[PDB]
Design a protein around this ligand. Structure first.
Ligand SMILES: *O[C@H]1[C@@H](O)[C@H](n2cnc3c(=O)[nH]c(N)nc32)O[C@@H]1COP(=O)(O)OP(=O)(O)OP(=O)(O)OC[C@H]1O[C@@H](n2c[n+](C)c3c(=O)[nH]c(N)nc32)[C@H](O)[C@@H]1O
Ligand SMILES: [Mg+2]
Ligand SMILES: [Zn+2]
Length: 1930
RNA sequence: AAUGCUAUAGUA
RNA sequence: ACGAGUGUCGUACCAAG
RNA sequence: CUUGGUAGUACACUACU
């Protein structure tokens, strides 16, 4: 109701006003106070300002466009010289910044491990290996620094000959601190392979030098005795990458590694991956299986597996190391050992592990040495070599542990489908990259993407990027090798750009069959020798960025780096940036007039698009609803609190360690690390802050009554003026890039205001086509493809139009004439700009958002005032430096020279820095996107004006994201060379970006002819493309470590996403197998391990155990990609159907097969199936095993996992929360919890929700603290600690198994059962439950029939017939055709149960009369599953046995009810996003067919034929059925049947066929006769006049309306045009009106003549008749540049030009045309071009249709969809696509040998191209053959049509991307369907006869007859597999 | 081909 | 030694002789 | 240096999809 008058007095607003010119100030002040309603019109203020600024906008546009002539095509083109100069500058800069070392002894280990081949002779017993190690160590020869220490250690761990004593002592210790060592001869044993130091066997000097220098244990000065000294200032030291000697050494090291590791192990390769998924991998691809087996046979795999296993052992043995005890770790290899030197307990804070590898090799030079060796020593038998000491943390140890999966994935990705790549090189590169855990390779993997991409681009500034940004960090030799590889790739990229060639594009005006880049291995590989395709080249470029490990950054240094960056930007802005508005494109300035004009135009368009925008914003963002309902306001994310939190931080004397802050007393005190107390006391102006969860902060605000129960938008508005100071902290994202980014965190107050403003911006941004932030996920990939397709079109027809007459003259010519005519023609140009913006938020002008807010017409003046006040306050926000950063800074003792942090903090006087110009990253995404889209619109306008100056053609599409820009530009012109156009476009892109306060990152921006690069997505030439390998790498890489099932679920979801992006089937199976193997390793579940569940369940192998119970996945790959994580149960049920169902019903529909599940006997079921069905029924449907103690869990926290291990619980984090104290004190109350429990029992709505009101939300959040799942969710848990806990404590109880329904020094993650006794408990409880036929009926009824999607997928697996292979030429994106017909529940499961709890379907946020259907479905589930009756019985029996009601038990039961209801409703929700398929689907049948075809064989994709109506939506068809629904269904049915009848059937037999269809067929599960009755009774009978004539002869009423609706001008098309946009078909057109009728006859680009049968001959009626006739929706563009020579007299059609391409068509005389054109010749020249000639005659107005006449006129023709309604007028039926023809159902139609029902069911033979059928395969034609005793094939083909068909024609498009287009033409007489079938039969039968001969004599030879008899018998005996039928048929 | 107001692991 | 770094860090901590 | 005691995650992790 009230504004904020204090806004006009804000200093920020005053500066903004003074910066502006005087009239603009008045305009802004008027716009702020302008209101929509009280004004006469809503679009009056925007119009005023737009008119005011139009002059300046137009002058700027014209001046920018005029630069086209001043552009000389010397654009920034990369070449060899640019790369060389940039490399020299980079070398100089790197030398200046970092110290360069030329000595090889300065290298860091490339891989922190050394390996040698195993010894077959020596056994694998631990004691024998230990004795051998001791003897080898004691036998070292020679002299060195540490040889004495190593000999002494060998003496210490030597056990002599008392092997039996050692074994029995170790067993005794393992049978069960201050462990006492027994003197085993010379050893001092405390445990298995652990030895205490022996001062008697070693010199003290040797021990000190080993533990101080070699290992670094205690070598430092403890940071207290290190005062003002030993602090060495030095630059980072790296090797010389460009040095010839260093590169030679690196190459030698790589060669040695290749030489040794290539040798085979010499053993049979067997492992989990093989034994589980080998068959599936081999079926998907044999080459992938061969490559994987060869990998398993090599020494690389054994090396990496040994390293992983040894590291897993090292981490396990490091828990209880003493100060003077060193342990020994072993592995599978009997020659590789590690010594774990004493260190801290590794599960503590930032604890590291110290180890040194020992390798025993018979010969020297037999040791894989990746720069980690310390020395090889000769000893007894062979040599012994020991590596340098290695210290690593937990995250690096994790990566090293999860190495083999990454190695295998990388090797299989690089090698896949490439025979010219040597596998050893790939495996060498992969083993060196995957084992990298250092920043060196991480500093090269990311920049290489940009370097090679900009080198390959048409134009780029790669020289600058190399000179300034590229900075290799070469501390290892492999880093030098990779740097040389990158340099060579950058050199080669330019030379091989021309080696990319486009594929032959196929056009149909509705779809593009073929597109993309040609598949020729011409490009040179990057990381290793060989040749690669463009897709493989891009994969090699982009994949290595995902090799990087996450969390390799160290907090001590990265926090300082981020603070330095932010403060440097801030100080540069403070000291150099003063002006705001600039017209010279100054940096960090905005042009005012242009910005205002563009904003006004875009706002006008957006508001004009939708009338109701304010409401759209209010409703979609819960503006009118309470704050508790909004999700982001109730999340568990972090939030900032500013106040007095001294006590909390203090809970967790010494000197401050900083000379500046030391007082007199502080001098005489010990130095110590800064904590909160010393920081607070010393630092005068320190603001105190803490971080608490968002929901906890909201609860605290509700307690203090800051926020009430008023609608959120009202609450946000009052706080915009109630909050005046903003504080923001920051932390490090921990990303995997070279430089980590900073993440800004703000308080709850700022959060809500930013939420409101950005929702306002977002709802407007969703109304524009440019911004891609609005779409979710891979929706962008679909858009990119659509834009590419439309540009490709526009280019094709524009180039054809501009050069059609030139090409015609060239054809008529056929040397010198060809040259000049080719010179004088338009040139097609396609340019793609892949642009990024540098420092999108840091160096961004924030004053344009003021104008954006002020010009918004959907806001009241008070709202504008409050939002502007909020923005002004935001400009005064202060960044709070984190306490850890202050601790680092205050612990220096040496003053940094250019200390920017101290400079900006008043010498660390305060921890707040006033950040003004920088709006923090991630806060203003949508406003920035809108402004960037406005800038792109300005750029588009400039480009259009410039192209108009050249009189060319333009098409600009600018994809917009937050800071990622994709601008694609298509130009057709003939005035100047293309290079000048490219230079002009790039310069104006710079100018347009600068005019709006942005700047394009040319240092990372590049331009290509074909490649589209939007955000992480590719579109080569309209073919969607993506690097799917990143999903596999991420799945194999970072893990949550939360639990065995959810880990596997995340891995399988990543595999599913990769499949969606085009992963070949074999690599997906490899990824799934690797995921299962890694999950088994993490929890010790391999065959024979501790937690192997195969012996605890009635299952033959792991394939028969559900994933939830730690089984392996068994499902078809196409089925997994469709749903995922429910495929196991679905496949199990499908297998049960395939087995038990009777033979009669097996190839029936899945519903029909389920219909006889009652006939099944429950007794004759195997144990495994009974167990799995009990699992399904009870656990999935009516949960009886609680996965945890479900005490405070809402109806949201149930997954599918049954055995969920407990996780960490952090006492400190909970004690931080303000609501946790309330929960504890309420729990401390004598009976407080019971009152809350019974209050919830009285209000069960709070279980599903979290409390719509204030008080109920308070109670719900208090109650949720009892769950111990929500408690452990708020806890701090890191993958590293969880991984080390899993690998350390495997026997600890971690699982809480309460059972069916219900029934000191404790660790943090203690549980109830030990993960193994849980199997026994689960099986025991399952034995109690019983199974009946009703239970099975419920399981099939719900998991399958409830969802149409499940019925459909099971239908796909039952009715599938695999067909002919064919190449993957053009890929396309199709999401899910007719989704709504497959969705059971409309709304989200949260809303459905929300409307179920409150017994009212009218809940806010949902749709009434749609909640009705959903609640009906839900209620149905509860009723048929007895979900309520069983709960009531249980409650009654519990109360009876107890004798009094139990609130807790009732709460548990009710929570379980809502929880299983939520799980059931969520199970019916499927989120299937965009897919990449070898074609684009038209129906669900086509989509499923494409999926199955693409997801079987990697090399080729097949075509599948669902035998019996796969969709089978019997219940769904009843749902969503309406009057118009049936009427639309009938229209499509009859269009399809008529067009099929006259397109494929012989004309003389078309009537009987139509009658047979209309009598005994059905469409969409609807009888056809009913549809015909609908057609006859419908009003629009005229649309099917030919059909009504051919059948039933219904007339006189349709005909009268047909000659009657000519009241408005009606247009008919006597013959359809073969190409509508390319202008290439026979055209016959007729337009009829009042006493007027014109008929147009022409072919392709030439119009022959036009007959005008006008009523009167006067030359005045002719013009009015012409304009009236040609002004109708004829659809003939009249763009036929076939201008006709003019003859005196007569009349010509001509088309004048009207702007916006609204050409006006008129009829004119010769003399009039000539006179007007000569008059207009006087000094844009618009000339009327006469096209076609007009014949004028006088005719009467008599009616032209009589029912009797039709039979005579139509006697000659026999066409069902077309009849001659007049002599030259044809009545026609609208066409429809033939993809819908599958929905037809009926008995086979027997036309001799041919069966027409299977023909019309066939999709490959329904094509209208003679060539596509003449060149088909027998397999496609086989399904048609139905012999019935026939021998002659010709008898059958007589029924096929003999009308001429289309044949493809090839043309060359003249454009800078050279490509050829292939389209259809009319053809000839001999090109008929029957001729094509005859040729196909002859060719394919000959080929089949020669293919299956395998006999000396021939095909019909008796021996071959017997062989074919054996083949058909094999099938007549073996069960019908996927491909048996086609062999028999052919 | 399509057309109903609520259409509801990743990116910087 | 190793990790990190053109920011001083980690390189276990405390008590006693 | 020698003999004893201690240590569960760098207690931190956002804004939009
Ligand atoms: O499913 C769509 C379309 O994809 C599919 N289809 C097109 N071509 C097909 C084919 O060759 N074989 C099969 N099996 N399916 C084919 O059928 C549906 C489109 O049918 P169609 O009837 O061709 O679509 P129209 O746009 O022509 O529909 P209509 O409502 O008649 O459009 C009127 C609108 O377009 C002008 N018009 C009509 N016709 C026939 C032409 C023409 O031949 N050339 C030009 N230049 N314009 C035409 C009407 O005058 C008006 O402007
Ligand atoms: Mg980009
Ligand atoms: Zn036969």
């Amino acid at each position: 109701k009230t504004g904020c008058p204090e806004f006009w007095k804000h200093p920020i607003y005053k500066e903004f006003k003074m910066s502006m010119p005087v009239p603009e100030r008045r305009l802004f002040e008027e716009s702020v106070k302008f209101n929509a309603y009280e004004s006469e019109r809503w679009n009056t203020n925007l119009v005023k300002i737009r008119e005011y600024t139009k002059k300046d906008y137009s002058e700027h546009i014209s001046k920018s466009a005029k630069n086209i002539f001043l552009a000389s095509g010397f654009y920034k083109q990369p070449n060899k010289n640019e790369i060389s100069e940039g490399w020299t500058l980079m070398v100089e800069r790197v030398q200046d910044q970092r110290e360069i070392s030329k000595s090889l002894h300065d290298q860091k280990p490339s891989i922190h491990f050394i390996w040698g081949a195993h010894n077959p002779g020596n056994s694998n017993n631990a004691t024998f290996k230990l004795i051998l190690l001791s003897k080898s160590l004691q036998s070292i020869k020679g002299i060195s620094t540490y040889t004495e220490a190593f000999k002494s250690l060998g003496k210490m761990m030597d056990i002599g000959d008392k092997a039996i004593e050692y074994e029995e002592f170790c067993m005794s210790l393992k049978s069960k601190k201050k462990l006492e060592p027994k003197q085993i001869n010379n050893a001092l044993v405390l445990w298995e392979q652990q030895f205490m130091i022996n001062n008697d066997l070693i010199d003290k000097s040797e021990k000190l030098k080993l533990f101080k220098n070699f290992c670094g244990i205690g070598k430092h000065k403890q940071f207290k005795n290190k005062m003002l000294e030993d602090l060495e200032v030095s630059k980072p030291k790296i090797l010389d990458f460009d040095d010839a000697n260093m590169y030679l050494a690196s190459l030698t090291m790589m060669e040695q590694s290749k030489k040794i590791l290539s040798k085979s192990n010499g053993l049979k390769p067997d492992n989990f991956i093989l034994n589980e998924f080998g068959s599936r991998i081999k079926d998907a691809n044999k080459e992938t299986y061969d490559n994987m087996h060869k990998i398993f046979e090599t020494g690389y795999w054994q090396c990496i597996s040994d390293f992983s296993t040894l590291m897993k052992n090292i981490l396990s043995v490091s828990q209880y190391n003493r100060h003077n005890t060193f342990r020994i770790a072993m592995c599978a290899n009997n020659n590789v050992f590690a010594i774990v030197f004493p260190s801290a307990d590794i599960k503590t804070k930032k604890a590291t592990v110290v180890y040194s590898i020992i390798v025993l090799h018979k010969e020297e030079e037999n040791i894989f040495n990746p720069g980690c060796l310390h020395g090889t020593f000769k000893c007894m038998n062979g040599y012994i070599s020991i590596s340098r000491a290695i210290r690593l943390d937990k995250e690096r140890c994790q990566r090293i542990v999860s190495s083999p999966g990454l190695f295998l994935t990388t090797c299989l990705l690089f090698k896949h489908d490439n025979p010219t790549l040597v596998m050893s090189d790939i495996m060498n590169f992969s083993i060196y990259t995957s084992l990298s855990i250092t920043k060196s390779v991480l500093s090269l993997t990311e920049p290489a993407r940009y370097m090679i991409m900009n080198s390959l681009a048409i134009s780029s500034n790669v020289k600058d990027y190399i000179a300034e940004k590229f900075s290799p960090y070469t501390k290892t030799l492999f880093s030098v090798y990779m740097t040389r590889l990158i340099k060579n790739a950058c050199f080669d990229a330019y030379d091989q750009r021309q080696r990319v060639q486009l594929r032959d594009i196929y056009l149909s005006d509705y779809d593009i069959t073929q597109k993309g880049i040609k598949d020729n291995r011409e490009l040179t590989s990057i990381w290793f020798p060989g040749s690669v395709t463009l897709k493989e080249y891009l994969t090699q470029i982009y994949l290595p960025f995902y090799f990087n490990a996450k969390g390799l950054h160290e907090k001590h240094h990265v926090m300082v780096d981020l603070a330095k960056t932010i403060l440097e930007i801030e100080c540069e802005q403070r000291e150099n940036i003063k002006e705001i508005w600039s017209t010279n494109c100054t940096k960090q300035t905005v042009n005012l007039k242009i910005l205002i004009h563009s904003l006004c135009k875009n706002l006008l368009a957006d508001t004009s698009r939708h009338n109701h925008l304010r409401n759209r914003i209010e409703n979609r963002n819960n503006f009118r609803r309470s704050i508790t309902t909004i999700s982001t306001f109730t999340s568990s994310k972090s939030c900032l609190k500013i106040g007095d939190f001294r006590k909390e931080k203090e809970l967790q004397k010494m000197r401050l360690a900083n000379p500046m802050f030391v007082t007199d007393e502080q001098v005489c005190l010990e130095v110590g690390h800064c904590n909160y107390e010393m920081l607070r006391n010393a630092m005068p102006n320190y603001t105190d802050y803490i971080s608490t969860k968002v929901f906890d902060r909201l609860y605290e605000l509700l307690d203090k009554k800051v926020l009430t129960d008023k609608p959120v938008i009202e609450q946000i508005m009052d706080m915009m003026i109630d909050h005046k100071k903003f504080y923001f902290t920051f932390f490090n994202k921990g990303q995997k890039t070279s430089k980590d980014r900073e993440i800004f965190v703000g308080e709850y107050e700022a959060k809500m205001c930013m939420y409101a403003v950005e929702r306002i911006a977002k709802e407007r941004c969703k109304l524009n086509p440019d911004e891609m932030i609005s779409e979710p996920g891979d929706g962008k990939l679909k858009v990119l493809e659509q834009k590419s397709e439309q540009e490709i079109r526009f280019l094709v027809e524009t180039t054809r139009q501009k050069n059609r007459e030139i090409d015609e003259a060239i054809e008529a010519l056929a040397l010198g004439k060809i040259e000049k005519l080719s010179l004088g023609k338009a040139k097609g140009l396609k340019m793609e700009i892949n642009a990024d913006m540098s420092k999108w938020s840091a160096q961004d002008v924030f004053y344009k958002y003021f104008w954006l807010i002020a010009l918004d017409p959907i806001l009241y003046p008070q709202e504008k005032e409050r939002i502007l006040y909020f923005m002004c306050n935001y400009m005064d926000k202060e960044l709070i430096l984190p306490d850890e950063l202050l601790f680092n800074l205050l612990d220096q003792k040496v003053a940094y020279q250019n200390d920017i942090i101290a400079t900006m903090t008043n010498q660390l006087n305060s921890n707040t820095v006033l950040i003004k110009r920088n709006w923090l990253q991630g806060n203003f995404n949508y406003t920035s996107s809108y402004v960037h889209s406005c800038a792109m619109s300005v750029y588009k306008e400039i480009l259009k004006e410039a192209i108009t100056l050249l009189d060319g053609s333009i098409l600009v599409n600018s994809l917009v994201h937050s800071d990622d820009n994709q601008t694609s530009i298509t130009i057709v012109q003939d005035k100047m060379e293309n290079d000048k156009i490219i230079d002009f476009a790039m310069k104006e892109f710079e100018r347009a970006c600068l005019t709006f306060g942005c700047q394009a990152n040319m240092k990372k921006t590049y331009v290509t002819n074909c490649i589209k690069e939007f955000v992480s997505l590719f579109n080569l030439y309209g073919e969607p493309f993506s690097i799917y390998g990143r999903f596999l790498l991420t799945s194999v890489g970072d893990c949550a470590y939360i639990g065995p099932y959810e880990d596997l679920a995340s891995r399988i979801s990543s595999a599913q996403t990769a499949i969606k992006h085009g992963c070949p089937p074999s690599l997906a199976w490899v990824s799934i197998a690797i995921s299962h193997w890694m999950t088994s390793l993490t929890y010790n579940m391999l065959p024979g391990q501790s937690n192997d569940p195969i012996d605890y369940f009635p299952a033959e192998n792991r394939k028969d155990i559900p994933i939830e119970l730690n089984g392996v996945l068994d499902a078809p790959l196409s089925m997994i990609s469709t749903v995922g994580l429910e495929s196991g149960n679905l496949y199990f049920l499908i297998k049960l159907l395939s087995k038990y169902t009777p033979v009669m019903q097996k190839r029936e529909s899945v519903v029909n097969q389920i219909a006889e599940v009652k006939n099944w006997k429950v007794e004759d079921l195997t144990d495994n199936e009974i167990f799995r069905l009990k699992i399904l029924r009870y656990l999935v449907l009516d949960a009886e095993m609680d996965p945890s103690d479900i005490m405070g869990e809402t109806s949201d926290m149930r997954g599918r996992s049954i055995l969920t291990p407990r996780k960490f619980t952090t006492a400190g984090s909970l004690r931080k929360l303000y609501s946790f104290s309330k929960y504890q004190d309420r729990l401390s109350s004598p009976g407080g919890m019971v009152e809350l429990f019974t209050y919830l029992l009285e209000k069960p709505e709070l279980l599903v929700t979290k409390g719509e009101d204030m008080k109920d939300y308070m109670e719900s959040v208090i109650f949720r603290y009892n769950s111990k799942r929500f408690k452990e969710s708020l806890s701090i848990q890191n993958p590293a600690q969880l991984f080390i806990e899993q690998i350390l404590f495997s026997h600890k109880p971690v699982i809480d198994f309460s059972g069916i329904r219900d029934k000191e020094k404790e660790p943090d993650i203690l549980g109830k059962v030990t993960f193994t006794e849980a199997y026994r408990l689960l099986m025991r409880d399952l034995s109690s439950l019983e199974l009946t036929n009703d239970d099975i009926q419920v399981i099939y009824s719900y998991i399958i029939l409830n969802d149409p999607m499940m019925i459909t997928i099971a239908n796909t697996h039952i009715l599938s017939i695999y067909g002919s292979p064919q190449r993957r030429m053009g890929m396309s994106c199709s999401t899910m055709p007719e989704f709504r017909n497959l969705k059971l529940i409309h709304h989200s499961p949260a809303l459905v149960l929300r409307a179920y709890s409150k017994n009212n379907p009218d809940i806010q946020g949902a749709d009434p009369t749609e909640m009705a259907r959903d609640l009906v479905h839900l209620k149905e589930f509860v009723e048929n599953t007895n979900l309520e009756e069983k709960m009531k019985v249980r409650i009654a029996m519990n109360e009876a046995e107890k004798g009094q009601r139990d609130i807790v038990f009732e709460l548990k039961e009710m929570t379980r009810f809502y929880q299983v209801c939520y799980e059931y409703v969520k199970s019916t929700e499927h989120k299937i996003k965009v897919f990449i398929l070898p074609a684009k689907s038209y129906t669900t049948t086509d989509f499923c067919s494409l999926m199955q075809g693409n997801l079987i064989k990697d090399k080729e994709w097949y075509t599948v034929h669902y035998l019996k109506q796969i969709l089978s939506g019997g219940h769904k068809a009843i749902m969503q059925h309406n009057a118009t629904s049936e009427q639309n269904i009938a229209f499509e049915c009859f269009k399809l049947i008529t067009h099929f009848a006259d397109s494929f059937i012989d004309s003389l037999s078309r009537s009987a066929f139509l009658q047979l269809i209309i009598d005994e067929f059905s469409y969409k599960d609807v009888k056809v006769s009913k549809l015909y009755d609908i057609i006859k009774n419908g009003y629009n009978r005229t649309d099917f006049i030919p059909l009504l004539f051919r059948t039933g002869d219904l007339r006189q009423a349709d005909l009268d309306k047909y000659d009657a609706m000519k009241s408005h001008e009606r247009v008919t098309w006597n013959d359809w045009q073969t190409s509508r946009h390319l202008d290439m078909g026979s055209i016959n057109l007729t337009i009829t009106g009042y006493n007027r009728s014109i008929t147009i006859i022409g072919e392709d680009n030439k119009l022959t003549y036009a007959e005008l049968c006008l009523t009167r001959k006067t030359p005045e009626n002719i013009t009015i008749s012409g304009r009236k006739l040609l002004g109708s929706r004829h659809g003939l563009k009249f763009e036929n540049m076939s201008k006709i020579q003019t003859y005196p007299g007569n009349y010509y059609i001509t088309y004048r030009k009207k702007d916006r391409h609204q050409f006006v068509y008129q009829i004119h005389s010769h003399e009039s045309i000539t006179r007007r054109n000569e008059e207009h010749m006087a000094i844009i020249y618009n000339e009327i071009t006469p096209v076609c000639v007009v014949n004028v005659a006088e005719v009467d107005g008599d009616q032209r249709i009589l029912i009797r006449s039709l039979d005579y006129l139509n006697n000659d023709i026999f066409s069902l969809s077309r009849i001659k309604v007049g002599l030259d007028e044809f009545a026609t039926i609208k066409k429809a696509h033939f993809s819908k023809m599958v929905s037809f159902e009926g008995p086979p139609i027997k036309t001799g040998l041919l069966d027409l029902t299977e023909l019309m069911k066939s999709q490959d033979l329904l094509n209208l191209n003679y060539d596509n059928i003449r060149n088909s395969n027998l397999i496609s034609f086989s399904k048609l053959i139905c012999c019935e005793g026939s021998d002659n094939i010709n008898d059958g083909l007589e029924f096929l049509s003999d009308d001429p068909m289309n044949f493809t024609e090839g043309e060359a498009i003249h454009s800078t991307p050279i490509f050829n287009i292939y389209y259809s033409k009319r053809g000839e007489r001999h090109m008929t369907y029957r001729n094509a079938i005859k040729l196909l039969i002859e060719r394919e039968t000959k080929i089949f006869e020669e293919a299956f001969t395998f006999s000396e004599n021939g095909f019909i030879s008796p021996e071959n007859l017997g062989c074919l008899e054996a083949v058909v018998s094999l099938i007549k005996l073996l069960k019908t597999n996927e491909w048996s039928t086609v062999i028999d048929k052919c």
